[PDB]
Structure 1
C-alpha cells in the first residue's frame, strides 16, 4: 500500500466513540501552524486546495504535507505570516485486511469470510468542497503558501484544484 492505494473509498464510514473496540495511534502532531491567532484577522487572502475528488487522505500523508511545510516555514520565520491548518480528522478508523490466507496456514486466516478489515490504519476523508490544507496568508508582499501548495498536493493523492478564497 503506497498512497496510490490509499486513494478512493469502498471503505464506508465507521467512526464513533461509543461503538469501537479501540483505535490505534495517529501521526498527527499539530493542526494550526504559523499563526495560531490569526484566521481571517491578519489574512484576508487564502488559497484552498479544493478536492476534485472524493478521496481518503490517509493519516500517513496528512502528517507528511504538514511537516514538510512546517520545516520549510522556519526560514522566513517559525511563526511567519501564514496559517496552515488541518481540518477534517481521521474520525473514521481505516480498516485494512491481512494477515489473510485461505488453506495451508497457521489456523487458517480466511479473507472472504472474515470480511472484517481488522483495524490497522487511520484515514481522514477529504471529499468534494472539503480541504485539510487551508492556508490563510497575507495580503501584500509575503505570500508564501502558493509555493507551499505544490508541497501540499504532492503529499496528498489526487488532482486538487487550487481556488483563491
Structure 2
C-alpha cells in the first residue's frame, strides 16, 4: 500500500514461474463460491461486475473485495442459492525497487541494470470491459447480489459498473 505504481500496465509479460520464485501466496480465497456443481446458470436475474477501466488489481485488491462481497451474499442463507464466480487470476507478478538495476522510477533501481525489483505481490489485470466476477440466482430479493458488488466495487482501483442483468 498504497497501490499506485502497481496497477498500471507499463510493463510487459510474466508471470513465469520458471523465471521467478519467492512469489507471495495469494490471499484471495477460492474462486468458486456459492453452491458450485449444479449449473447456477439456470437462473433469473443476471450479472454484474464490469471493470470499466484498465488494469492490474492485486490479490490484495481482490480477496477483500470479493469475500467482502460474499459476506454480504451470506444473506441468502448460507448454502442456499447462487454461485459466485471470479474471473481472472492474479497471475502477473510485480517487482519493486531493489536498489541495483537502474534509477528513478520503479522497475529501475540504482546503477544500471542489476536488481530488478524483488518479487512482492501479484495482480491480475483487466481491460476496459471485462466481467470481474459474476454470477446470480433468481431474484432472491430486490437484488442482494446487486447490493453485493456495491461493496465489491469500492475496493478496486477501477470504477466498476453494476451492469444490469
Q: Structure 2 length normalisation: TM-score?
A: 0.79
List per-residue Cα deviations over 1:104-133 (Å, max 9, x = no partner): 999997265436121111111122332232
- Superposed displacement of residue 65, structure 1: 1.0
Asked if the contact 1:133–1:152 (Cα under 8 Å) also holds between the matched residues in 2, the reply is no
- The farther-off stretch of 115-124 and 104-113 is 104-113
Q: Structure 1 length normalisation: TM-score?
A: 0.79
In structure 1, how many angstroms separate the alpha carbons of the residues matched to 2:2 and 2:105? 27
SS of residue paired to 1:37: coil
Change (3 A) 1:75 1:163: closer
More strand by share: 1
Structure 2 unaligned regions, length at least 5: none
Asked if the contact 2:33–2:84 (Cα under 8 Å) also holds between the matched residues in 1, the reply is yes
Asked if the contact 1:73–1:80 (Cα under 8 Å) also holds between the matched residues in 2, the reply is no
- The farther-off stretch of 138-147 and 26-35 is 138-147
Change (3 A) 1:48 1:74: closer
Asked if the contact 1:7–1:158 (Cα under 8 Å) also holds between the matched residues in 2, the reply is no
Moved over 6 A (4+): 100-109
Aligned residues: 165
- Superposed displacement of residue 149, structure 1: 1.4
Change (3 A) 1:163 1:5: same
- Superposed displacement of residue 33, structure 1: 1.1
Change (3 A) 1:106 1:156: closer
Change (3 A) 1:85 1:103: closer
